Write an enzyme that holds these catalytic residues in place. Structure first.
Site, short mmCIF file in Angstrom:
data_model
loop_
_atom_site.label_atom_id
_atom_site.label_comp_id
_atom_site.label_asym_id
_atom_site.label_seq_id
_atom_site.Cartn_x
_atom_site.Cartn_y
_atom_site.Cartn_z
N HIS B 41 0.81 -1.23 0.00
CA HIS B 41 0.00 0.00 0.00
C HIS B 41 0.84 1.28 0.00
O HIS B 41 0.26 2.36 -0.13
CB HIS B 41 -1.04 -0.02 1.14
N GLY B 143 2.96 6.09 10.07
CA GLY B 143 4.36 5.94 9.73
C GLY B 143 4.99 4.63 10.17
O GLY B 143 6.13 4.34 9.78
N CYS B 145 4.03 1.53 9.50
CA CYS B 145 3.91 0.43 8.55
C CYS B 145 5.28 -0.03 8.08
O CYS B 145 6.21 0.76 7.93
CB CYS B 145 3.04 0.84 7.37
#
Ligand SMILES: *[C@H](O)[C@H](C[C@@H]1CCNC1=O)NC(=O)[C@H](CC1CCCCC1)NC(=O)C1(NC(=O)OCc2ccccc2)CC1
Ligand SMILES: *[C@H](O)[C@H](C[C@@H]1CCNC1=O)NC(=O)[C@H](CC1CCCCC1)NC(=O)C1(NC(=O)OCc2ccccc2)CC1
Lengths: 306, 306
Positions: B41, B143, B145
């Site tokens: 993503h 942030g 991820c």
């Protein structure tokens, strides 16, 4: 979101752990530049422990009696000295992995990460607080002496604890990195006991703010309290006094949540007097006191290190 | 003695974290040999999120659209591919800090350490379990991820989780390192919810053995129970069924403490039916289920890593 008992990344400290063997005793040392730091009771034997005179014990040692293993490389000891209850072994090789570092002596209530080690090899990392009675509730087996506690500020490791011994209640006692014990303890096999502990009030309040930041609000109320009337309640429940300096430190968290510090104190009052009635806060059924106000802000805003 | 929620030393993983930026999105990548792994993503925009077709999205990308920062060194991307829900960015430099490693897909109930990261820089480390409903109760902000979860076996890092998203209950969902989500979740902005969770029975029992190893015995009793009659009680309290395989795994802990597994089950029965009556176990007022039998043995016997 979420809130966890978070330790600092341990990599900078892992690169400093070594094995120190003298006689029949093995423990961990901390290797920074060309010095290895370790507990001085490494020079004790199974028949010195009752009342050692470490000055006498150390003058009888030679450099070659100290066997320092950094992984599968022996480090040669070229000098030794004693500073309070820590031994400093000078070796002929500077640790190339030495981080930027400070030695700091922390106050009760302050938290730190412990890198538990055996034979110079790390086992795990966890977060501790210095209790008001100057013990820490750690996880330490035989061989763990010389494991250190630390904090990190951006790129700098501040070492604050090195492990020496376990007290009869199963809690732990040790020194700063300059060898000064926290609390009244001594590195001598004699009658020693922790003494009465208290709960770290300013930290409980920080953790209640962490709960609010994360969406638990069931414990809030419309009341307030004065500092005096709060401390009268804390006194009764074996809580540390809350000072005006504590109130000021909780300022940022108060401003972020919109809940005045003294209003949070009124909530803590009711929790102390009524219990939680089968409810939890941040996954705990107890009031948690091993997060400082700075810990809460760090974790809820995403501070990193290098 | 003592028992703490212990994470693995994070150093081997810290050396692998990088920053990945594409468009207006920044997150973390995992750099192993000449490949950076990150959530797919990252290629989403603030107007793709509703129902992305990542195959279409990726064919529109060029290598130079991916900005990979390893500290203060940019890494040049020379190829990219998608494997399930992870992006693999091939770079022209092999990570010299690459540990011995495996990718593993874990079962519910298994624990691991999470190295939380922002902008490729580590923030903290903590211990998690994969819940029975395939979420984890983490601590993750925007942030984070691409932060990974892992275990260590002597010298080998087994990566098992990479972080993708937060569900409406404030719990977390992500993939193995080959990009397969744990649970039914999808990397798409749609109605998704955790679903009912249960307590990890075999782990609670392990933690009760940890308590006995550490000197809490107040919860023991003289009774026993059958597996069937135990699971009839667990069913009612939203506990996972205990299998014979669970019983076998608890064998070592049973043998070390002298308390047959089914006797410990009878103790857990009474704790479920009576509560703790204002008492604690290993510093908790709740029954703890994020320690596996292996975690207990590791911490109580002092296993190290290299
Ligand atoms: C070092 O690796 C080790 C770690 C320790 C083992 C178990 N858990 C731990 O944390 N430290 C010791 O073994 C230590 C060695 C002595 C310290 C004092 C100087 C001589 C060496 N011993 C202890 O931890 C113990 N306790 C102790 O000294 O404290 C006071 C006491 C103990 C027992 C009864 C009354 C008073 C456990 C010996
Ligand atoms: C990545 O760093 C980030 C981490 C996340 C932010 C807050 N806490 C965290 O753990 N991930 C996201 O922001 C993520 C991005 C989308 C994922 C799906 C594909 C498009 C990008 N967004 C989320 O975490 C959220 N939730 C979500 O997608 O789940 C289902 C849902 C959410 C809200 C209502 C109903 C259903 C929070 C957006």
């Amino acid at each position: 979101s979420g809130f966890r008992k978070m330790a600092f990344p341990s990599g900078k400290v892992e690169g400093c752990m070594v094995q120190v063997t003298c006689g029949t005793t093995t423990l961990n040392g901390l290797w920074l530049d060309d010095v290895v730091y370790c507990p001085r009771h490494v020079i004790c034997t199974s028949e010195d422990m009752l009342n050692p005179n470490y000055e006498d014990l150390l003058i009888r040692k030679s450099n070659h009696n100290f066997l320092v293993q950094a992984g599968n490389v022996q480090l040669r000891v070229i000098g030794h000295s004693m500073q309070n209850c820590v031994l400093k072994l000078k070796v002929d090789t500077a640790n190339p992995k030495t981080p930027k570092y400070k030695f700091v002596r922390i106050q009760p209530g302050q938290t730190f990460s412990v890198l538990a080690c055996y034979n110079g090899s790390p086992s795990g990392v966890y977060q501790c607080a210095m209790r008001p009675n100057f013990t820490i509730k750690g996880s330490f087996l035989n061989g763990s002496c010389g494991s250190v506690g630390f904090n990190i500020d951006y790129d700098c490791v501040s070492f604050c604890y090195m492990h020496h011994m376990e007290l009869p209640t199963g809690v732990h006692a040790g020194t700063d990195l300059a060898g000064n014990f926290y609390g009244p303890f001594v590195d001598r096999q004699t009658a020693q006991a922790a003494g009465t502990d208290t709960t770290i009030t300013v930290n409980v309040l920080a953790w209640l703010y962490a709960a609010v930041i994360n969406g638990d609000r069931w414990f809030l109320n419309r009341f307030t309290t004065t500092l005096n009337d709060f401390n009268l309640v804390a006194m009764k429940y074996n809580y540390e006094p809350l000072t005006q300096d504590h109130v000021d430190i909780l300022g940022p968290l108060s401003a972020q949540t919109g809940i005045a510090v003294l209003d949070m104190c009124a909530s803590l009052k009711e929790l102390l007097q009524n219990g939680m009635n089968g409810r939890t806060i941040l996954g705990s059924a107890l009031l948690e006191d091993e997060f400082t106000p700075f810990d809460v802000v760090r974790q809820c805003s995403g501070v990193t290190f290098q």
